[PDB]
Amino acid sequence: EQLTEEQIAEFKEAFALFDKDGDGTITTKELGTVMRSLGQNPTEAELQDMINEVDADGNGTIDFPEFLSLMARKMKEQDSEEELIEAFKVFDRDGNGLISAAELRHVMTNLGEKLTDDEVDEMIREADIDGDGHINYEEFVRMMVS
Numbered sequence: 001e002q003l004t005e006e007q008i009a010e011f012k013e014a015f016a017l018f019d020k021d022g023d024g025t026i027t028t029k030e031l032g033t034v035m036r037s038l039g040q041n042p043t044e045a046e047l048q049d050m051i052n053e054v055d056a057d058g059n060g061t062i063d064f065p066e067f068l069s070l071m072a073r074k075m076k077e078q079d080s081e082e083e084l085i086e087a088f089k090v091f092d093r094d095g096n097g098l099i100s101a102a103e104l105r106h107v108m109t110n111l112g113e114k115l116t117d118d119e120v121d122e123m124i125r126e127a128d129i130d131g132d133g134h135i136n137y138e139e140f141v142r143m144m145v146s
């Protein structure tokens, strides 16, 4: 077990958007066509680095198996990032992108933890990198995964 016929069909449809000429491979040129359509104009060197990250056999192009492997893993990545984003936006009660001590304390009380200002201040100091006494999303992620 691994993938349904419907999952493979949608991966194949995604691959086809890149594989302009239908030869079963994605070249640097084709990847460039797609990004250019999206508003980015990478150089050949930048495109090569992108292919090199996903071209497992080193033949210079990305085939469908290589694209399935990298995509399926990107979607695990994305599912874990979404979980940290949702957790953050809850802590960040006013939506300003900074969890304050007051916000952290309120949400911790709802999570069943009645903490003092000093306790909360220590939690933030542990995670605070830029020294503003607040936790931004990078600081939050960094702490949560490490």
Ligand SMILES: [Ca+2]
Binding pocket: 018, 019, 020, 021, 022, 023, 024, 025, 026, 027, 030
């Ligand atoms: Ca092609």
Ligand SMILES: [Ca+2]
Binding pocket: 041, 042, 043, 046
């Ligand atoms: Ca560039």
Ligand SMILES: [Ca+2]
Binding pocket: 055, 056, 057, 058, 059, 060, 061, 062, 063, 066
């Ligand atoms: Ca390859």
Ligand SMILES: [Ca+2]
Binding pocket: 092, 093, 094, 095, 096, 097, 098, 099, 100, 103
């Ligand atoms: Ca806030």
Ligand SMILES: [Ca+2]
Binding pocket: 128, 129, 130, 131, 132, 133, 134, 135, 136, 139
């Ligand atoms: Ca901070």
